Structure formats: C-alpha cells, structure tokens
C-alpha cells in the first residue's frame, strides 16, 4: 500500500498533468460530436419535410 500507492500517486499525477489536459481536449471533442449528431437529425427531418 505504501510502496505501490506512492508509485500510483506518482504515476497518476504524472499522467494527470499530461492527460487532464488531453482529457479536457477529448471531452470537448466528444461534446461537439454529440451536438453535431443533434443538428444532423433536425436537417434530415427538415429534408424529409421539404
């Protein structure tokens, strides 16, 4: 628990510093994709309307 979790916290905080930035980067992209998928349907719906 001491040896491993100290390594884990070091591995985590080293990853977190590099990857919390890349998480934020990823999250935004995901959100954008989701939004787009939402506009896609309204345009398909309106296409089939018109």
């Amino acid at each position: 628990m001491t040896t491993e979790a100290k390594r884990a916290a070091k591995m985590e905080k080293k990853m977190k510093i590099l990857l919390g930035g890349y998480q934020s980067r990823a999250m935004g992209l995901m959100k954008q994709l989701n939004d787009l998928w939402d506009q896609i349907e309204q345009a398909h719906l309106e296409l089939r309307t018109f």
Partner: protein, 96 residues
Amino acid sequence: TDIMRNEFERLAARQPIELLSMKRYELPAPSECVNNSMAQLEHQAVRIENLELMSQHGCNAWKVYNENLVHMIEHAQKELQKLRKHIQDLNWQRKN
C-alpha cells in the same frame, strides 16, 4: 422485449433510486482485517501495474483518442452541409 434486465431497470428509473455499491474500501479502520489488508496490497499492486499500463497507454495514446474524435466530428458537419444544400434548393424551387 428484454429479460429480467428490463424489470429492475424500469423499477430503478420509476422509483428514482440507484442501487448501492461497495462503500467499504475507502474508509476501513486500523486495529478479518488480515484479509482486508491483503486485499489492499494486491489492489495497490494492480493500480501500480494498471497505472503503469494506464500511463503507458495514456502516455502515448493520450491524444490518440483526440485524433480519432476529430475525424468523427468533421464527418457529421459534412452531412449538415449536404442536408443544408438539398433543402435550400427545394425551398428555392417552391418559391419560384
């Protein structure tokens, strides 16, 4: 049209109550605990192993997902345009 899964899922949503998970590992107490201790050591080892594995995957992959997510996004907005162009044409036709 599903098995037991649908009965407990619809009951969980109707009642507005999520099933309780293992609220045990985080708290614990010093001075049965020989087992609980040996659980923690193995879990910590796995975390280091997983952390190395996770870091190892995150360390090079950390951004690989982002590269893929940008290819996935642009494809949707190309469709948005293709739909935009048809409908506009239709409207113009009607107007004329």
